[PDB]
Amino acid sequence: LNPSARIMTFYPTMEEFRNFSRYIAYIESQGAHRAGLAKVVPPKEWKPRASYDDIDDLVIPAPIQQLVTGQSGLFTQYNIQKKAMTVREFRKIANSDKYCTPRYSEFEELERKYWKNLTFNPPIYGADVNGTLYEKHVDEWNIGRLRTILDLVEKESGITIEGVNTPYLYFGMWKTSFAWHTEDMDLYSINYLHFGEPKSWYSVPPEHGKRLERLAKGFFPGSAQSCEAFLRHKMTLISPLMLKKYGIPFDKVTQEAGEFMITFPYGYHAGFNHGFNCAESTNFATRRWIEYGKQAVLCSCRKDMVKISMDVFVRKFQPERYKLWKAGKDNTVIDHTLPTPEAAEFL
C-alpha cells in the first residue's frame, strides 16, 4: 500500500466528498498517510464561498515579518510582529514591486530563487488569523466543523485551542515560509487554498520522521539541548538539497487555489507561498491518532504551547489499556504504515 511513500492526489465525487472522516479513512486504505501529506481536489460543483470580493476590510491583527538567518541550506526564522493591517493593505504590499513573485518558467526555477533569496528582503506573512472564509451553510469539508473525534476535547472539557479545534487563516505573499514541523500533539491538519498563488510543500514520511529529527539535532545542537521538541517552535528551515545530501526521504507538491492538503500524524512538512494567497487550516483526529498523541514529544521550554490531555481518548477508545497507560506501563510501538481502523470498511 503506497510502498514508495509518495504524495498521492485524490479526486472525490460529491457523494464520496460528503463524509469527511470516512474519506480520510478511504485515502489511508490507499496508503496516502505513508507520505505524510496528501492532496484532495474537491468536486468541481463544490465551492466554500460565493466570492472573495468582500474580505478586503478583514483585519490581520498580528502580521509577522519573517527574518531568516543562515546559510548552506540551514536557517532559523525569526517572526517579528508588525502592526495590524487589513487584507487590502496586505495585498498592496504583496503585489508591489518590492515583494511580488519574481518572473520564472518552471516551478524548479522558483524553488531555486526561494532557497537563494530566503534571507533577503524579509516578507510579511498574515499568519495564524482566527477565522473562516467558509459560508455558514457549507456542509462538506467545512474546516469550522469537520466532525472528527478531536471534538471530544471541547465536548468534554469546554477547551478551545485556537487553530487546533478552531480555524486559522493564512494570507501569504512571495517567499513567506512555514518551517519544518509536525502538528501539535502530532495531529492531522487540513489546509484549503481559498484563492491566489500556489503554496509549495515538502514532506517527510512519518516512518522516516525520526531521521529528520536526528539530523536537525545535529545541525542545531544548541536548540536541541534547551528543547527536545525544538522543531515545534516552527523556526527551522532546511532545504531539500540538505535532506537529499543526508539521505532523508522526502517528496514535494505544489497546492493550487481550490485544493486541500491533508497532513498525517507525525508527518513533517515545510514550505513556502509563491505569491499573494489565502489558506485556511485546522487540526483533526482519527482513532489512529490516539497513540500518536499519547507518545508525542512535547515542547518543554515555552508557555502557551499546545497540550491536550489524552485521558478522555484512552478512556473512550482504549479502555482496556487505560489502567496500564495511567500506570506508565503502556509500551505500544506505533506502526506508521497501518491505516486508521475506520479504513476496515474499504479493506
Next chain:
Amino acid sequence: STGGVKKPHRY
C-alpha cells in the same frame, strides 16, 4: 492539562 494556542510566539 489541556490548552494553549497554535499561533507560535512572535518576536
